[PDB]
Amino acid sequence: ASRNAAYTVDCEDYVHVVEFNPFENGDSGNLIAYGGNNYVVIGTCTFQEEEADVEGIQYKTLRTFHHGVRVDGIAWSPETRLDSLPPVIKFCTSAADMKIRLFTSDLQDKNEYKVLEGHTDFINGLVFDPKEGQEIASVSDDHTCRIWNLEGVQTAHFVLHSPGMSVCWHPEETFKLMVAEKNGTIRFYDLLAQQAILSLESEQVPLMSAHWCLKNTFKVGAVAGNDWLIWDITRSSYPQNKRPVHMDRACLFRWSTISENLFATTGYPGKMASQFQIHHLGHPQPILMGSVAVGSGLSWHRTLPLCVIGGDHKLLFWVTEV
């Protein structure tokens, strides 16, 4: 069977991408960002698993920003905080017009952002400098990974052998970047030497999404063809764990924010609903399976065993055992 959503929130447009804030900087830890056909929305979610006087969920919008294009990807900066007067909301997005939009807001009645241009077709993946907040890495169909400062200048780049599908910055060794390519390769790059470090293979094409386990940095996890794929960098260039997951191909991967053995994956948008699953390395099966009308994106709550997926005019949320 499917599990129904635990919690749901309705929107003024479709949802294409959704990401929680991963950072603990100044009461920001319950922020959520999501993208539609002309805009990006910033809000907060509190749950009955975190505040004991909440029945189920409190969703609250903080600001919407309209920019006349679809939103295709989102990344948060570590500078983001609610403890400050004024607050600081700082993030970036990718969009259909092949450009990056850097947003910085004091939660006033504003529609202010900075544009960064120079990728030549679409941008699949974004990540900030995870520590100081002063740069952005971005991967694209144009066979490049590109680093950019807040001043909007491209500061470094790496050429790829097929479209760049995923990117991850290391939080402690902040000179190390992971990239994954549609050809099935996952590479690590050094930002100070501007060189490749090592690579891994999927055995499978296309690779659609990859993610680095920021609770055990030796673990990589991805989806390619119909498998999910997991490596341990201390052992082999091939997937130490491989399993078929989705019939209609597999699209997204995310490790849990809280547990180095817990992760989630989506199928493709098959005919009525995107299917998704939550997997656990202790188990021979998924522990949760779900299904969403036009189901889009994939993210995890910063502190809960709780995931979010977008879809047809909605955000939908699921809680899991660990």
Binding site: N37, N38, H66, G68, V69, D97, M98
Partner: protein, 453 residues
């Protein structure tokens, strides 16, 4: 049977004596054949210096006396006794005779070495060559500007080939000095904040001066300079008839004035888009010369050429305006096929997608709406900026071309970058009577503030 390369123009008279021929031969024997090379006394001297390197400091006078017999030294040494120069003077003469065989690589090789050598002497050599190089860039521009005056004084003086060759030598020398300045900038990585800024300013000014020299040279080759003022002498050349082109674009702004009626911009021109990006840097330059306006077209070709000396303007934007003016020059003489204008994209290695963007932007300002659209749709044409989409749509709207605005929107599907552009695209639909499409596009942008507007 060949020579070697002449190390100067004119060559030293020793160069022509038969002891400088290179040639190859076969000897016939009572049993077989054998081949040999006669490497002439220039190649016998250079392949001696190549073998003498490990003791060169003992052999400087022997190398000097060989180069002074092979025709490898400058003619100015032929009256000079080797025993009335220093070993340093004999070494600058030999180093000249080892760069006049080649170009650049010894100087960049000495910079990369003296940085990796520690020595306080070599730190003073690096300083000396940097100060020698910067005073060279200054003196080469002082001589270049002193050469090029007859192109812009209205004198109509067709230049002597020796003046053209002097301008080519100053351009080549500026380029060589630019590569010496970049070789300081790539390797001297511990030069402190203000020294790095002082070096960077010298490289950027040298680069801008090299571009100015390259474009002034091409405008001289393609027959556009000297800037000859209109009086009736029948010769095959092109000329910059600023009066005709000014009467065109001042009449063209008056087409927009009388069609827009104050609902659309009189400055819908694509060229009053391109120049508008560059603003006060050019709007004040195009008022320096008598008859300058601050708007296109410029009042002299020198006001097109000092555009290359601009800081704060990118090369693609400089060349975009230059190609626009070359198209106006070709369109001023449509009784001809004067081809060397058409070299300009290649001589500055500009992409075909940039050339077609400029051509479509020129055709729309010249009142073509067919070739002016379907060259913008042609698949290399560089993806336009949002202000360029809204300029093109406003240019059809300020003229009356309901369908040509819609054909552009239905193809380029452009980024609706503000409420002004939502109002523009709503008008795009409503003037063609696209009433359902206007109502759905209205609903897509009717946000919780601007909905009533």
């Amino acid at each position: 049977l060949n020579r070697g390369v002449p190390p100067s123009y004119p060559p030293p008279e020793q160069f022509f004596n038969p002891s400088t021929y290179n040639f190859d031969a076969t000897c016939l024997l009572n049993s077989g054949v054998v081949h040999l090379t006669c490497t002439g006394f220039q190649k016998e001297t250079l392949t001696f210096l190549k073998k003498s390197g490990p003791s060169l400091n003992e052999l400087i006078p022997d190398g000097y006396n060989r180069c002074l017999v092979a025709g490898l030294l400058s003619p100015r040494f032929v009256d000079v006794q080797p025993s009335s120069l220093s070993q340093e003077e004999q070494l600058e003469a030999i180093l000249s005779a080892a760069i006049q065989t080649s170009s650049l690589g010894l100087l960049t090789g000495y910079i990369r070495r003296w940085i990796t050598e520690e020595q306080p002497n070599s730190a003073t050599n690096l300083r000396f060559v940097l100060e020698w190089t910067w005073n060279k860039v200054v003196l080469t521009k002082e001589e270049f500007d002193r050469l090029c005056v007859p192109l812009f004084d209205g004198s109509c003086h067709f230049m002597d080939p020796q003046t053209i060759q002097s301008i080519q030598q100053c351009y080549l020398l500026l380029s060589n000095l630019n590569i010496v300045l970049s070789c300081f900038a790539s390797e001297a990585r511990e030069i402190t904040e203000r020294g790095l800024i002082d070096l960077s300013n010298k490289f950027v000014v040298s680069h801008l001066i090299c571009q100015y020299a390259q474009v002034v040279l091409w405008f001289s080759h393609s027959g556009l300079l000297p800037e000859g003022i209109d009086d009736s002498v029948q010769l095959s050349r092109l000329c910059y008839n600023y009066p005709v082109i000014q009467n065109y674009y001042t009449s063209r702004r008056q087409k927009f004035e009388r069609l827009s009626r104050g609902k659309w911009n009189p400055d819908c021109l694509m060229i009053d888009g391109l120049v508008s990006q560059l603003g006060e840097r050019i709007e004040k330059l195009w008022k320096r010369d008598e008859g300058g306006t601050g708007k296109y077209p410029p009042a002299s070709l020198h006001a097109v050429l000092d555009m290359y000396l601009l800081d704060g303007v990118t090369e693609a934007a400089k060349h975009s305006i230059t190609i626009y003016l070359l198209l106006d020059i070709m369109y001023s003489f449509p009784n001809k096929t004067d081809t060397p204008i058409e070299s300009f994209p290649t001589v500055f290695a500009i992409s075909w997608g940039q050339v077609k963007l400029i051509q479509g932007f020129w055709l729309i300002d010249h009142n073509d709406y067919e070739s002016g659209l379907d060259l913008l749709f042609h698949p290399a044409t560089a993806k336009p900026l949002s202000w360029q989409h809204s300029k093109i749509i406003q240019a059809f709207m300020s003229q009356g071309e309901h369908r040509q605005a819609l054909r552009y929107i239905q193809t380029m599907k452009p980024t609706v970058s503000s409420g002004n552009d939502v109002i523009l695209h709503l008008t795009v639909l409503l003037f063609n009577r696209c009433m359902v499409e206007a109502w759905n596009f209205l609903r897509q942008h009717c946000n919780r503030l601007n909905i009533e507007e």
